[PDB]
Amino acid sequence: MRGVIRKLNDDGFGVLKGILVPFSAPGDEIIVERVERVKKRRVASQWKLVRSSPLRVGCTLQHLNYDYQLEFKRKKLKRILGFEVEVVPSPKIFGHRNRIDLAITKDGIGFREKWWKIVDIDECPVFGKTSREAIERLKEFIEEEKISVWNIKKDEGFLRYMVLREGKFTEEVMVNFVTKEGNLPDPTNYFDFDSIYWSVNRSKSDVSYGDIERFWGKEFIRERLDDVDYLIHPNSFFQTNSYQAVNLVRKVSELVEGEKILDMYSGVGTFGIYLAKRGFNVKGFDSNEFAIEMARRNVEINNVDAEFEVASDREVSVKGFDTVIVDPPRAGLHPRLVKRLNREKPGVIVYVSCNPETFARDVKMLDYRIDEIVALDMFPHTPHVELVAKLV
Numbered sequence: 001m002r003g004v005i006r007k008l009n010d011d012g013f014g015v016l017k018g019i020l021v022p023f024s025a026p027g028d029e030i031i032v033e034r035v036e037r038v039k040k041r042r043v044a045s046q047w048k049l050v051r052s053s054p055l056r057v058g059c060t061l062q063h064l065n066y067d068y069q070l071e072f073k074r075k076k077l078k079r080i081l082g083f084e085v086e087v088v089p090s091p092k093i094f095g096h097r098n099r100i101d102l103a104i105t106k107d108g109i110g111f112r113e114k115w116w117k118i119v120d121i122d123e124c125p126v127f128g129k130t131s132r133e134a135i136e137r138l139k140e141f142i143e144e145e146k147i148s149v150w151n152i153k154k155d156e157g158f159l160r161y162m163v164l165r166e167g168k169f170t171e172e173v174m175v176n177f178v179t180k181e182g183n184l185p186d187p188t189n190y191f192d193f194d195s196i197y198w199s200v201n202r203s204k205s206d207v208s209y210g211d212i213e214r215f216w217g218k219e220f221i222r223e224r225l226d227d228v229d230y231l232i233h234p235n236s237f238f239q240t241n242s243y244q245a246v247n248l249v250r251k252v253s254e255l256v257e258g259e260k261i262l263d264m265y266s267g268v269g270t271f272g273i274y275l276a277k278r279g280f281n282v283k284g285f286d287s288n289e290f291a292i293e294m295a296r297r298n299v300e301i302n303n304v305d306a307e308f309e310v311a312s313d314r315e316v317s318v319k320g321f322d323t324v325i326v327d328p329p330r331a332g333l334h335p336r337l338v339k340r341l342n343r344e345k346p347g348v349i350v351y352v353s354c355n356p357e358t359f360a361r362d363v364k365m366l367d368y369r370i371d372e373i374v375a376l377d378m379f380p381h382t383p384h385v386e387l388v389a390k391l392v
């Protein structure tokens with residue numbers, strides 16, 4: 001119950017002689033007051049910081065100097081994968097995030113702390129100054145139009161979330177008001193952003209997206225990575241760190257070989273479209289219809305020639321490609337896809353993953369070795385990292 005934190009575990013929690021301590025730093029001198037058990041482990045729920053570590057300044061690592069965050073990620077990857085992996089710093093570590101979902105509740109605007117309690121905020125520094133402006137306009141909108149907001153105790157109220165998105169390289173901003181059934185007052189006199197959306201979440205789930213009801217201004221905003229534009233819709237996924245996303249698409253384009261590329265699990269075509277712009281012959285697949293539709297829209301606005309189709313990893317053919325890129329969901333690569341890759345043996349596989357343990361698992365099953373690998377800090381202030389591996 002007393003001692004110095006020696007390291008962080010893989011979720012970012014301080015390790016003191018096999019008790020866990022959240023938001024602690026190696027080198028912290030602490031006294032553990034209260035313990036609790038979380039999945040058969042002792043977790044320090046009340047502790048006293050006696051001496052602060054010199055490493056100190058979802059953001060569970062935000063109390064740590066950035067260089068130490070990167071050191072923690074290097075060490076974690078080496079533990080999981082078995083060897084040193086370079087970690088590329090995010091070009092920016094505040095203002096880098098291009099989407100935030102703010103809950104709008106009786107007792108404040110921000111996010112759940114103690115799930116029943118809201119943390120009220122005036123700005124979100126990882127998103128940047130646009131959030132301060134949106135929040136301040138939102139308060140005026142709510143106040144002057146007397147808008148009913150979420151009462152979390154009863155789960156009643158009209159307005160639930162304000163989701164803010166922006167293109168870091170285009171300066172376009174989209175705001176999306178997610179509500180229950182109702183009538184949203186005209187938001188046009190309160191916001192000056194390029195796109196304003198009203199979405200109605202008609203399910204019982206607490207979610208920060210819903211059915212598109214109306215938009216004012218642009219139907220889509222854009223983000224731009226180098227010379228490639230990507231349409232952003234309230235309901236479509238896009239890498240959340242625009243600055244690192246630039247390094248990620250460049251890195252993928254550098255690792256592929258040949259001319260014929262498969263962009264497997266393409267989503268909205270982040271890799272495939274960038275590669276088509278660079279002159280590759282690209283086909284991409286994803287099981288999500290809406291994502292594929294966005295990828296097709298992206299092909300059009302960039303005037304490239306690439307094809308995207310909806311298919312499951314259980315069925316996709318990998319025949320006839322020079323490089324196959326895979327960016328699988330949390331489950332990793334379907335076993336049938338691994339069999340197909342083993343049989344067809346494309347010259348190069350590029351595997352992108354923010355789940356190092358699943359990557360490590362799948363690579364053992366593939367008849368390939370790691371030729372090159374780097375991690376990109378896509379997720380500053382969290383324990384997560386994005387790996388990009390070239391397999392041959």
Ligand SMILES: Nc1ncnc2c1ncn2[C@@H]1O[C@H](CSCC[C@H](N)C(=O)O)[C@@H](O)[C@H]1O
Nearest residue numbers: 265266267270286287288312313327328329
């Ligand atoms: N069983 C399956 N078969 C094919 N696609 C799947 C799948 N399960 C999930 N997906 C898709 O797998 C993708 C993983 S995220 C991939 C991100 C994409 N490369 C981008 O840059 O934006 C998602 O787009 C998801 O819709």
